[model samples]
Target: MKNSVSVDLPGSMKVLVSKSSNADGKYDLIATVDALELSGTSDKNNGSGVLEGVKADASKVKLTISDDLGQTTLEVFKSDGSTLVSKKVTSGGSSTEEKSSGGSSEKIITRADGTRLEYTGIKSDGSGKAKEVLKGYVLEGTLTAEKTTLVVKEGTVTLSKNISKSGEVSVELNDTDSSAATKKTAAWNSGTSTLTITVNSKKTKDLVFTSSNTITVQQYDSNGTSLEGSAVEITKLDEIKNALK
Candidate 1:
């Protein structure tokens, strides 16, 4: 699954650096081959140790940033160390950016009354007319499972389609955990990619934030069945509130 990837960095202050660093900018990339990393650090706290940059192709540069450390500082560059890849703000200092395009935008969609809304997909910009599925089979139902539940059938999981708005996509656990009341804490990581959420002591949630104009969030059942999945595009991951739907 190798594709062309650029770096998503901080605007007012960053760029996509190579696992790489900054001679021109001083920022370190820690490019785990565009993989997401964690914690506040990056190269300081709990950074991603450049796992492995796999075969790259002609794909829009995508970087998944997670953690609180990169709130205002992170620069990434190409391996040559000259080309800017992307900039990300992981820490809590000055989370700002300028020309940085291709980053995940956090999105929050709630019902009119304020309850959370679980959506599958949004209509593309061009389909105002209705379509008849006269020749198609229609069958839909809800299957709930715990986040901790093992991959039994692992049914079919699909990724979000047409994520032109943001890179950070998600799927609620669709299950439950009544054992612990975990703290609601969120943070961004610097220079790398990765966001983490914790639910009591029972679980931790991780998601990717890409800035690519064309990206999708794909999910497969534990056993890997290919089917339509439920997910939405998050325009921005700002002042974190509703972490899950």
Candidate 2:
């Protein structure tokens, strides 16, 4: 199937879209009556007859693409408009689709196994750097645990960071040096469920988690020696929402 469509863009100009669909999307008739004759024969097909349909754009072009159940090509125009290539894509035998509706959009490379590679908050020609993500698993929250020990004392405690994503843990507290600990760095080890909060690149602690709400405070000295600090149970985390959920 070959079709041509035009769309407007935010970063560039009007774009042409070329679609070559390979999905057997047409509804079949008289194919199911073979099953009623006996028992050995059966031919009943029920599937989506269209791969992708064109939806009008908002501030950005929002495309709705259905799976063709095989390798398909969606020809997206270049920003230069003088040259064109096999720039658009669909995966081999996908069971999903690409839906879009927003001022901000992403470049999603649909895979063969029904998964996709999403370029976060980036443009087609790569104006800005984008974070490549396979799927969603980011946790964000802010909370204070019950503890005056382990340097969480003499200040308010907060954990505001994505726990599932391996990003730098952002902390809020001021103590010891009255100015130094706030500048300290922390990171989340999602595999071991550990938060390695480091001070002067030495004072480390694993806010280790065994359950949903408990994080064990495993402290370390300047020389990487374990002090085995007491467990700090953070029972309250404000808005602990999962990105994938």
Candidate 3:
């Protein structure tokens, strides 16, 4: 059976740009068109039966920008670059005026536990939060595959009061070749506190360090000479980083 449907069109069309950035500041632009057109004569089939056309001359576009940042009136042209279809199109421009001028102060704890925590941030004053989600942090988990593998997940260390109270945070991966004695090692230090731990080859472990954190050593079969020091590469730091959220 041959059938068709008339897709009703809105009387007005809207285009909202939530974020627009140039050399200046960031702003948002919302534009509305006064006219709408359908592709077909019956609102279902138009010029090419697939694409619709709106006579640019019959439509009026209005643009609103966030704050007092005014927009520029753009002139829309045809494919030939001569048909001046629109003169009031929104260009979403920025303003040159300074909004306000003031300042705030804070007593940032530069020295944590008297060790002087190293702050790395986007700003020059060592301000801003760390991208902990992107930084190197390991997640220990078992590989369901035939071979056991070690994995490392990246961390986004954001700046926080607790973070500011700490000295340093780091992650390390230890591998063992002997399946009978594969001891995986991970360590981290926060201020004077340090932590160390060992996990079995196929087992998973998570080691978190905070202020006053101390390392804990796990001993595998140390005297077992028969337990060869060669087994499998348990962790892949790159793989874990790729899986970062």
Candidate 4:
């Protein structure tokens, strides 16, 4: 009547969620699930074949800490062999949880053919704000997916520099577009549900961004141009991803 569980990193990276922070006093570590197995099930025939289910749930990682420094967060960054999503906590500190009551959230980027690039944000910091801890910020509702549209509810963009161009903000499906220039315009459809803003140098430098922007779905042709009688209500960004592909 006993059981045990163990975990590891998925990739061959030697990164460990150590109790020690990095040289900059940061405890940001990355690891992959290497292997997993379970024993001590309901075995009868001399422990030959028992009711056991071994699942290799790879493609997910976990972050850990050793101390409670008031408010600590983890973010799931989109690595494109280059430039990382480096940003400080712009909004505010999360409310502390008395016990270990946090959970994980998965963002499934799927296609029409059922092929998808699933990016999951796993956490264990006693709070269930997985999206906040994983993405460092909330996604915009302009995320386009095949059969699904990622209609962002509310998001804030905290810039560290200045933006001097009229850019479009679109969601990055997979590791395709992570640059600042690849954003899709936050347009409205049907009636009025999308939010679009032109980021100027002054706005970017002053760090002025908006939040609580809602999104609505409208019918579009092959060229992505809105068509008549094609408006729908989108709840999440993953839905847009499924609709685009």
Q: List the residue pairs that clash in candidate 2.
A: 25-49, 69-93
Model 2 ranges off by over 4 Å: 1-98, 106-195, 200-204, 208-217, 220-224, 227-245
Per-candidate TM-scores read 0.18, 0.27, 0.19, 0.19
Cα lDDT tens digits for candidate 2, 1-245: 03433433221222233332225532221111111210111121222121222223211111222333233233322344333322344344332233333433444444443333344343444332222222232222221221111112223333443322232233333323455644445666657766666666675666664433233465576585565647554343321111001
- Candidate 1 Cα errors over 4 Å, as ranges: 1-25, 33-57, 64-118, 124-245
- Worst 10 contiguous positions by lDDT, candidate 2: 33-42
**Between candidates 3 and 4, which one is better according to TM-score?**
4
Q: Weakest 10 consecutive residues, lDDT, candidate 1?
A: 146-155
Q: Which ten residues in a row are the worst by lDDT in model 4?
A: 201-210
Instruction: Write down the worst ten-residue block by lDDT for model 3.
Output: 40-49
How well is each residue in 1-245 modelled by candidate 4, as lDDT tens digits? 11212222111222323344346543333323235322322112111111111234321212222122222222222333122222111112222222111244334332223223232432443112112111222342211221222223222332111111132223322222244553332322213323322222111100012122233444433333335454454455454343332
In angstroms, the error of model 2 at 77 is 19
Residue-wise C-alpha lDDT for candidate 3, range 12-99, written one tens digit per residue: 2333332323344432333333353322111111111112233465432222221222233323335554444433312222111111
Candidates 1 and 2 compared by TM-score, better number: 2
State each candidate's clash count.
65, 2, 26, 34
What lDDT is reached at residue 165 by model 4? Answer: 18
Return the lDDT, model 2, position 112: 45
How far residue 64's Cα lies from its native spot in candidate 3, in Å, is 41
Give per-model CA RMSD. Answer: 20.6, 15.1, 20.4, 19.2
User: Whose lDDT is greatest here?
Assistant: 2
Decoy 2 TM-score against native = 0.27
